[model samples]
Target chain A: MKLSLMVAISKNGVIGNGPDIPWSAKGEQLLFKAITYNQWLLVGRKTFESMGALPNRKYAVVTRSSFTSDNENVLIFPSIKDALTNLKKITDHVIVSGGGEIYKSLIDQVDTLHISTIDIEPEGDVYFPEIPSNFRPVFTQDFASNINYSYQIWQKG
Target chain B: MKLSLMVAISKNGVIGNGPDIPWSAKGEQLLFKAITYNQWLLVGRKTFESMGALPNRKYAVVTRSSFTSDNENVLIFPSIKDALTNLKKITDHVIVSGGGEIYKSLIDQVDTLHISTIDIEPEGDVYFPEIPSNFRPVFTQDFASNINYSYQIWQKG
Candidate 1:
């Protein structure tokens, strides 16, 4: 399976704070929605709960304990390993969408990264893990709308 | 006079730690040297003192106290305003190289920004000031050598 991760990070490496993203960038949201449109999105319980019932995507929540969701498209798994085991049966691509712990756990194991880099730095307690050196930047493009940002894609060799 | 600022910042917006930058990239160093070559280079006392006697550039140190340097290409000024006053007399262009304090004071006022965006995050106490919205990105190029980074130039609209 081709496992990919998508996240928006501040220039200060912040991803989110207390189950919510600190800033809103319309362009970044569109980009994220487009990338994960038809793929299985693996997210931590907090991120899944914070952004509940996203449309047109298969959602999988990775939790440490048993959890249940009423949404037909949403699936709950006790671990990332269990989530992937089921997701790979349906599709070749899975986007590991995040909260901080979920990303830290899978960043080293993922094959690709889709990063939206916000130009401004805001105060936050949670941070995105650094991309390991083995993953190389394959593409990058800057955008300016509500906020200035760059969309970068990295691939592991 | 045309004023330009140059810096290499991490994903976490960190530019320096103590008297020097927190990380090193050979390509970033070469890019800095090339852009500031044969121009008046402005920097804070700590940053100037940390990097002594760079060649082929007129170096001006901005400080609040009386200071003297024996290097022929080096000059000292009590403030950024004073440094610009002297630099304008000699050249039409000046590169505002930095420490955190110096960048914070000049980032908004400078006409151009040469930002090297490194793709790694490290622990740091000092950060580059956020680029004002008026400055629009005009050019960007990614490079991977010792480290992965993007060279971005922003111009005031």
Candidate 2:
């Protein structure tokens, strides 16, 4: 299974503000939905809290604290290792959505990065970790929006 | 005058380990010299101390603390603004080389980014600030080295 990180980042590596993302773009949202369609998603507990259980997909939410999941499509795991081993069996691809800390945790093992780079610089409390040396951009397409953004696929060496 | 920030950054935003950059790439260093050749350079005191008086370049070493410079080619400034306002008279371009704090202080005002993206992840205490939204990549070329790297020029919007 391919392990990918999917995030929308501001020009300065800002990714989110607590449970909320700081900026909104219609096209960015659309692209995310299209790419992640019916795939298995990995997320930190807060991401699951903020974005909630998106439909048409399965989830493996990583958290140290136990939480009850009323939804059948979602399951909680204690660590990335636990989730990935099991996720590898059930899904062909794994997309790790985030809560900053989780991204830092799983970054080393990720095989691909799907990034939506936003053009605006807003105050951000949560930031994405730096793109490591082992990855290079494979594809990029610019899109116009309320704020301009670019869609990029980065591959690992 | 065009104000630019020239830096060799690792994949994770790490720029330095105190005065020393942790990784070495010959092309990255050569690219820096070629771009900044015979131009006015702005740097923080520690940077001036670490790299020490490069040949064929005029220097504006910014520091609040006083220092004695025996070099005829270097001048010390108390602030980025003071150096920049005066540097504008003598040079058409100002390349703000660094100490981490200096780069952070001058980042917002920079018009272009001359970045040498090195391809290794080493431990870093000093880092380049995230590229602001107003800047977009205008040119890029890849190079092979001891460690591969990319040289990119980004323009301000």
Candidate 3:
């Protein structure tokens, strides 16, 4: 079984400013959709709320507060640990889609990371956690339109 | 004439922790040496002091105070503007090999940037200036040994 973290971060490591990601590049959006389509997606409540529910994916929201979604495709969990325990039984792969806190909590557990590193530096309140040395960069591709970006993959050594 | 900025930065835009870069990767070091050799390199006084004098390159140190260097290859200027004024007469190309202050001062004037974006995010006091949208990423190549990194080129568009 393998769990992967997927995110698009600014050159400054910022993932979110307020409730949403402040910048968007078309290539990164397409890349994110392509990679996480069939996998079970685990994310913090804030992250799920920002993007809403997507089709063809099983969604798990990690929250400490009591909350429920009318969407049957979504599952509510009290913690990351509980979500992962159940998700592993359903599928061999899970993608830890984000918000800052969820990425901080699950980074140690996940063995792979699919990161889209945006070239621009923007003001933000939320930041992705510092990547540890154990995660090796296995691949990278450059993409651009209005904004320039690099899609990179890191595998745990 | 072209002014270029060269820096090795962390994913979070960090360039230095104290006087030195916090992380080291073998490929990045080799890349740095290859590009800056025999070029007229402009740096802040602190940056020049930390790295010492290099052979085969003419060094211009930007400082507000009176300074002297025993190294015959080193020259001192009161400001970045002053250094550029003098460097232009000597060579058409100048590499803004920096400490944070120098990068911030010359970023707008520089037409090209040779940036090595390291994969790890580390604690640091000095950061490369926020890259303006006018600069577009034209090229990038990933490299790794003990750490993962991308050598990227930004050209003013």
Candidate 2 lDDT (Cα, whole model)? 0.81
Kept native contacts, as fractions per model, are 0.00, 0.00, 0.00
Instruction: Tell me the tens digit of each residue's lDDT in model 1 across A1-157.
Output: 7788989999999888787788987556766755565458899998888898677677989888777898888999988888889888877768889989999999998987888899878878889987898988755555555677787777787
Candidate 3 segments exceeding 4 Å error: B1-157
Error of 3 at A59 (Å): 0.6
Q: Estimate each model's TM-score.
A: 0.50, 0.50, 0.50
Worst 10 residues of 3 chain A by lDDT: A137-146
The segments of candidate 2 whose C-alpha lies over 4 angstroms from its true place after superposition are B1-157
**Model 2 chain A lDDT-worst window of ten:** A30-39
**Candidate 1 docking class:** incorrect
Those runs of model 1 whose alpha carbons end farther than 4 Å from true positions after fitting are A1-157
In model 2, state the lDDT of residue A101.
90
Backbone Cα, N, C clashes tallied per candidate = 1, 0, 0
Model 2, position A138: C-alpha lDDT score = 61
